Amino acid sequence: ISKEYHIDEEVGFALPNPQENLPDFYNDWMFIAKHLPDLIESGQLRERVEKLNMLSIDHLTDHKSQRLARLVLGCITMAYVWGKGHGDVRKVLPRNIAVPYCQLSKKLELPPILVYADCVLANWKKKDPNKPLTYENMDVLFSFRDGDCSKGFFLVSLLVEIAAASAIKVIPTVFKAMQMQERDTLLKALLEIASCLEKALQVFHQIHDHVNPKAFFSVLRIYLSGWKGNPQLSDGLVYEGFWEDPKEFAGGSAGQSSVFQCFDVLLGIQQTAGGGHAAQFLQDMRRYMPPAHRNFLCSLESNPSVREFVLSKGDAGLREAYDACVKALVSLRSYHLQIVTKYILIPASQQPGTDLMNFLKTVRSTTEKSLLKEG
Amino acid sequence: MISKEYHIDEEVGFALPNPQENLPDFYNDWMFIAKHLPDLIESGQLRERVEKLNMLSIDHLTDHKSQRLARLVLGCITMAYVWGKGHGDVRKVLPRNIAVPYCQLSKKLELPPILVYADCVLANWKKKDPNKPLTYENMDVLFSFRDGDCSKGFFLVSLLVEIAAASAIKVIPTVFKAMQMQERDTLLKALLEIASCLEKALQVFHQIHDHVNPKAFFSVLRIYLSGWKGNPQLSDGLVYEGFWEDPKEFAGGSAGQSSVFQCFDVLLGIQQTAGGGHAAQFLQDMRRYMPPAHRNFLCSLESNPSVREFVLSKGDAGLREAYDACVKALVSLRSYHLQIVTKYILIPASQQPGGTDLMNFLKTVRSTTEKSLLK
Numbered sequence: 036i037s038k039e040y041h042i043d044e045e046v047g048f049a050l051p052n053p054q055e056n057l058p059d060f061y062n063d064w065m066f067i068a069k070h071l072p073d074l075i076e077s078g079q080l081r082e083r084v085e086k087l088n089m090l091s092i093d094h095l096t097d098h099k100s101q102r103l104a105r106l107v108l109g110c111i112t113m114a115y116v117w118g119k120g121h122g123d124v125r126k127v128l129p130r131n132i133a134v135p136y137c138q139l140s141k142k143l144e145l146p147p148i149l150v151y152a153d154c155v156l157a158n159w160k161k162k163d164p165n166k167p168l169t170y171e172n173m174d175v176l177f178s179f180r181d182g183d184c185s186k187g188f189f190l191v192s193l194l195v196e197i198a199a200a201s202a203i204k205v206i207p208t209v210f211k212a213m214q215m216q217e218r219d220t221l222l223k224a225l226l227e228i229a230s231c232l233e234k235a236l237q238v239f240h241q242i243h244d245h246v247n248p249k250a251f252f253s254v255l256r257i258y259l260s261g262w263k264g265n266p267q268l269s270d271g272l273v274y275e276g277f278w279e280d281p282k283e284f285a286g287g288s289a290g291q292s293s294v295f296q297c298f299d300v301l302l303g304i305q306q307t308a309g310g311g312h313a314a315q316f317l318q319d320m321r322r323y324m325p326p327a328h329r330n331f332l333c334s335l336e337s338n339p340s341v342r343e344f345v346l347s348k349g350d351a352g353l354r355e356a357y358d359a360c361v362k363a364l365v366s367l368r369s370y371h372l373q374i375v376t377k378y379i380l381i382p383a384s385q386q387p388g389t390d391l392m393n394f395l396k397t398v399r400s401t402t403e404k405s406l407l408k409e410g
Numbered sequence: 411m412i413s414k415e416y417h418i419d420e421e422v423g424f425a426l427p428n429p430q431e432n433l434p435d436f437y438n439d440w441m442f443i444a445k446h447l448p449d450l451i452e453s454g455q456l457r458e459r460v461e462k463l464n465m466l467s468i469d470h471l472t473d474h475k476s477q478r479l480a481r482l483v484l485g486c487i488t489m490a491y492v493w494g495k496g497h498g499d500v501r502k503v504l505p506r507n508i509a510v511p512y513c514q515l516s517k518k519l520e521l522p523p524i525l526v527y528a529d530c531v532l533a534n535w536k537k538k539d540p541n542k543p544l545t546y547e548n549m550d551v552l553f554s555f556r557d558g559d560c561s562k563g564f565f566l567v568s569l570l571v572e573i574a575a576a577s578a579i580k581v582i583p584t585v586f587k588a589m590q591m592q593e594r595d596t597l598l599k600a601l602l603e604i605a606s607c608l609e610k611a612l613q614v615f616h617q618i619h620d621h622v623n624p625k626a627f628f629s630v631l632r633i634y635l636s637g638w639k640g641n642p643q644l645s646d647g648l649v650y651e652g653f654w655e656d657p658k659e660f661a662g663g664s665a666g667q668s669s670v671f672q673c674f675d676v677l678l679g680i681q682q683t684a685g686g687g688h689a690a691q692f693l694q695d696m697r698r699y700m701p702p703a704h705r706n707f708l709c710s711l712e713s714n715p716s717v718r719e720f721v722l723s724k725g726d727a728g729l730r731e732a733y734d735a736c737v738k739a740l741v742s743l744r745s746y747h748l749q750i751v752t753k754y755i756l757i758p759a760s761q762q763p764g765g766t767d768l769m770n771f772l773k774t775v776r777s778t779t780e781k782s783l784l785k
């Protein structure tokens with residue numbers, strides 16, 4: 036894989052060893068971002084952001100410091116917009132934060148809202164660098180509220196991204212085997228991908244130890260929410276000093292994960308084909324991924340179809356191995372639907388989530404229908 | 411210099427070189443209807459003739475050129491059938507005999523089952539005399555809808571603009587090689603060469619006034635190019651009988667489906683698809699209405715390093731001037747397009763007892779182009 040796609044041998048689409056501290060110049064951003072639970076509870080978040088001077092982004096020289104700054108400002112933005120998460124909202128992001136956040140956003144080519152790539156892919160650290168990438172040796176950099184289970188939700192997502200990284204590095208082998216007409220290597224490679232996505236499902240299981248349904252639904256979900264098709268901000272958000280009209284941007288989503296999409300693309304499971312809402316949504320989320328990763332996806336599409344290759348050969352072993360990859364994705368979707376019932380639907384029904392359920396039902400359905408032989 | 415997998419011709423660029431006029435005998439029934447659309451629509455014979463067709467297999471369309479002609483054929487028939495005489499009586503259902511093969515062929519070519527720019531411009535032409543050049547006077551379209559519809563003018567002037575732009579497309583490898591090799595003089599020359607062709611392409615655009623009449627365009631041709639995405643006349647889309655039980659929405663023909671309309675923006679790092687705006691949304695969506703080879707090309711352009719960041723980093727007035735000349739030439743093309751939309755859509759509409767949408771789209775594209783100036 037070309038290093039120009041920003042994919043790591045070890046952590047895959049995750050930003051390897053993200054930067055924790057910014058330059059001292061940015062101490063005022065860092066303070067607020069580091070103390071969102073405390074500032075929100077004390078009712079001083081909106082006051083502190085308003086007392087900020089407009090800082091230059093020019094001292095953010097490298098990619099990682101720029102990415103750290105995006106996480107910092109995106110979390111501050113979510114805290115500023117949503118407040119205590121009980122309906123009192125702001126519809127104007129002040130210039131002192133809005134301007135540099137948008138400057139930095141345009142430069143990195145992400146929209147100025149917190150995305151998956153901020154709060155999962157850049158939002159982590161090893162505790163001891165020598166010790167391996169395990170939950171106990173890891174931690175998130177930023178959270179919204181005390182008891183929000185943001186560490187669990189984000190790190191468990193990150194660990195799935197990492198798990199899937201072992202499959203990602205096999206992708207080159209697949210197209211090379213196709214180009215070379217090397218059937219045995221193709222078979223071996225597809226089995227290895229299947230094996231890696233199976234492992235990734237076991238990593239997904241860890242969620243239950245680190246996230247409870249009430250804390251996620253009643254708190255965390257709120258702070259990840261966006262302002263595209265949201266009654267609370269019908270027309271979107273005003274980035275004072277940068278854009279004159281309010282702009283709409285979608286909130287965080289698993290559809291923003293590149294591993295959530297790349298294996299569908301690999302296997303010719305045409306998730307973005309046809310006019311359907313799920314397809315549209317999945318394509319739209321490419322623009323919420325970093326450009327290099329967005330580029331990885333559409334360049335996978337430009338390569339020849341693994342599916343048509345496999346369909347044409349009259350080779351049961353190849354078909355089995357292709358199906359094993361597909362089956363593994365079905366399993367990941369099914370497990371996700373279970374997680375959506377426990378963490379969204381049930382909590383919702385108790386008060387005096389369905390779109391995500393149906394979205395995932397469609398994604399699972401499309402995945403399952405791309406099997407060559409039934410699972 | 412440009413890979414053949416991207417289906418770009420050196421002479422005609424994104425246009426299908428030397429398009430096919432006649433399909434196999436097996437499809438004489440498709441061809442009779444398509445070649446006589448003016449007579450069959452006016453006389454109200456069109457719909458019955460389509461209705462009495464037998465469902466032909468797409469297996470006998472062997473080569474890409476014949477496969478593309480067949481789309482041009484079925485696409486026009488589909489618009490005729492849907493819109494009829496263009497007076498408001500429409501068909502919410504496309505019959506299985508035509509719909510099944512059109513959908514099967516569409517899936518095969520990775521295009522949606524609706525007439526697109528690549529059908530009715532890039533594949534809808536012939537030379538009168540092969541020995542004489544690619545000029546309006548030596549050329550003809552293959553299919554029109556109605557008498558007096560100016561489809562010759564509208565389609566061929568679009569094609570000639572595509573062809574004029576082809577001169578610049580072949581310089582794209584020079585640009586990327588020059589960056590990689592750190593060849594400043596080559597890059598300057600290359601950018602100036604690109605700006606020269608886009609300036610030329612603007613003068614080719616001026617011909618539209620000689621061959622196209624506002625009334626005829628607005629009241630006749632525009633109706634046959636309309637699709638069924640966000641259209642009050644088919645609110646749920648069209649039923650493709652036999653293929654889907656539910657009606658699917660698809661957008662009508664558009665300049666945003668032209669690959670040259672998009673590719674130089676990408677080249678020059680103008681982020682027309684950035685932000686969550688409507689114009690950016692549309693341009694991305696229209697990539698899936700381009701032939702997949704051309705869709706891929708735009709994707710590989712995106713994935714290459716930024717010409718804009720290169721010119722900006724270098725601190726070189728000459729390079730900046732040569733880059734700005736390319737941007738200035740794109741601005742002029744959008745400005746000219748807007749004047750045409752005023753003449754051909756806005757004014758006619760004012761006299762009649764989504765022109766504003768197309769104007770706003772173009773205004774957003776022009777604005778974004780202007781903002782990429784360096785001076």
Ligand SMILES: CC[C@@H](NC(=O)c1ccc(Cl)cc1)[C@H]1[C@@H]2C[C@@H](Oc3ccnc4ccccc34)C[C@@H]21
Nearest residue numbers: 150151188191192195287288289294295367368371
């Ligand atoms: C708490 C965990 C949950 N996380 C989120 O939903 C999430 C949502 C918004 C944000 Cl801002 C951050 C995280 C879960 C991760 C891993 C999950 O992986 C996958 C699911 C389904 N299919 C797949 C096919 C291939 C590869 C991975 C897949 C998606 C997502």
Ligand SMILES: CC[C@@H](NC(=O)c1ccc(Cl)cc1)[C@H]1[C@@H]2C[C@@H](Oc3ccnc4ccccc34)C[C@@H]21
Nearest residue numbers: 526527564568571635663664665670671743744747
């Ligand atoms: C009647 C002509 C007009 N045609 C159409 O709008 C048209 C619309 C729908 C269909 Cl089904 C067929 C044609 C015009 C062509 C060439 C026009 O080129 C360009 C405009 C603006 N900017 C540009 C920047 C770079 C390169 C080309 C550009 C676009 C479009």
